[PDB]
């Protein structure tokens, strides 16, 4: 199969440099051009340009001339994108994609999110959300997990190591004063909790935080 694997999320301060990678497999790397497309949070797709995988020569769209550089490591079938003198506006997700003669991208990397910020990395505090000790109980019960005060994104939140997948809602993190806050809820039959344990597993890669918070009755 054909696949493009991009490097992990990057946190950089303004004025710094970042270099991300896109590893290709399943096809002859040098037989197809590699293109780069970026996307600012909540906005549209922007074509940055492409690299000739045979020649190595890059061509940039006007909006990306100057600070951007496409390079290759042919032997490792990998394409790179380096951005110089980062600006807060460079905060976005960068995708690599293989271009076909039929003029379309048939395969894309999952994208690499780079956030440019002066904010300092900080681990989240994880709090269990259980119904009040004096609240009415129904047929179903909803539990929660509050992941507060961390930076930067992302954080992963699952329930019972993933075994509990239905009835789950994880709300998009919101930024406030250099810190993100996110929450997640799970709804299970009242006959399953608290008799059966329910725990939220949260991880914040940037701070190597990993906590498995069991939700217990108050």
């Amino acid at each position: 199969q054909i696949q493009l694997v991009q490097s992990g999320p990057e946190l950089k301060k303004p004025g710094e440099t970042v270099k991300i990678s896109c590893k290709a497999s399943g096809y002859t790397f040098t037989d197809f051009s590699m293109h780069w497309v970026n996307q600012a949070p909540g906005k549209g797709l922007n074509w940055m340009g492409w690299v000739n995988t045979e020649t190595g020569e890059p061509t940039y769209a006007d909006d990306f001339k100057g600070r951007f550089a496409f390079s290759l490591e042919t032997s490792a079938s990998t394409a790179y994108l380096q951005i110089n003198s980062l600006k807060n506006e460079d905060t976005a997700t960068y995708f690599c994609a293989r271009f076909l003669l039929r003029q379309y991208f048939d395969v894309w990397g999952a994208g690499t999110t780079v956030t440019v910020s002066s904010a300092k990395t900080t681990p989240p505090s994880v709090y269990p959300l259980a119904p009040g000790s004096a609240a009415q109980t129904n047929s179903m019960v909803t539990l929660g997990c509050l992941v507060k005060g961390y930076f930067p994104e992302p954080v992963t939140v699952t329930w019972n190591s993933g075994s509990l997948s239905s009835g789950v809602h994880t709300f998009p993190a919101v930024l406030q004063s250099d810190l993100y806050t996110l929450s997640s809820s799970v709804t299970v039959p009242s006959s399953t909790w608290p008799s059966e344990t329910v725990t939220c597993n949260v991880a914040h890669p940037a701070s190597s935080t990993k906590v498995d918070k069991k939700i217990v009755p108050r």
Binding site: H35, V37, G44, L45, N46, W47, G49, T59, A61, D62, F95, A97, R102, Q103, Y104, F105, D106, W108, G109, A110, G111, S125, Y127, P128, L129, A130, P131, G132, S133, A134, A135, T142, G144, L146, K148, H169, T170, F171, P172, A173, V174, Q176, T181, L182, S183, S185, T187, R218
Partner: protein
């Protein structure tokens, strides 16, 4: 640069209905050598990379259902989706590769309509753990409702509290087309223990009166 103009910016239809979106290019995308229009359509779901649906203006990529149909030549193009389902919720982009730089349209966001649904509201007092430090966050989940338009008001001892609240909405559900939202009111431990009644009121068109969930501290 060739400008791609997509319309409408957003579409809302019920499951099973047909939808058509337009993409107009600032100049013909017809290649005389191949006799093909270099126009492609891509579908991008929340948190995912785009995926091609149509290329050469009307050729379906292998794996794409017949219900997705691309039409057009020159400057006028369209993408039509029949038997629309929640699974189709995404932003659709057209892209020309006739003359560099390749350019994308602004996209058309497809959202689904469905029966109105009242939110299931749950309120959660601050956790013992959070209290141990100097904080206190009260959380209310408003789950599986429709439409997306909803208002949450926080009250402490009966009076509205506007500062310190953070709200977040999920993307439309990929299966049942509902929305969910979380509202978090953060206060200091002192403020929290200085008052007794905490309630979040949800105002939604599904009810003439707001849904109220509350708890009293001294009852904990």
């Amino acid at each position: 640069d060739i400008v791609m103009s997509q319309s409408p910016s957003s579409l809302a239809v019920s499951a099973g209905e047909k939808v058509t979106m337009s993409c107009k290019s600032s100049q013909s995308l017809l290649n005389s050598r191949t006799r093909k229009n270099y126009l492609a359509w891509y579908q991008q779901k929340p948190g995912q990379s785009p995926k091609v649906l149509i290329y050469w203006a009307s050729t379906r990529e292998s794996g794409v259902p017949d219900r997705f149909t691309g039409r057009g030549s020159g400057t006028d193009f369209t993408l039509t989706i029949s038997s629309v389902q929640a699974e189709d919720q995404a932003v659709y982009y057209c892209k020309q590769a006739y003359i560099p730089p390749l350019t994308f349209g602004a996209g058309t966001k497809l959202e689904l309509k469905r029966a109105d649904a009242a939110p299931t509201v749950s309120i959660f007092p601050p956790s013992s753990e959070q209290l141990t430090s100097g904080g206190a966050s009260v959380v209310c989940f408003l789950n599986n409702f429709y439409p997306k338009d909803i208002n949450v008001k926080w009250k402490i001892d009966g009076s509205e509290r506007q500062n310190g609240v953070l709200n977040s909405w999920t993307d439309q559900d990929s299966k049942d087309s509902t929305y969910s939202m979380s509202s978090t009111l953060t206060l200091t431990k002192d403020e929290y223990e200085r008052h007794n009644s905490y309630t979040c009121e949800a105002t939604h068109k599904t009810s003439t009166s707001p849904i109220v969930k509350s708890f009293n501290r001294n009852e904990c």
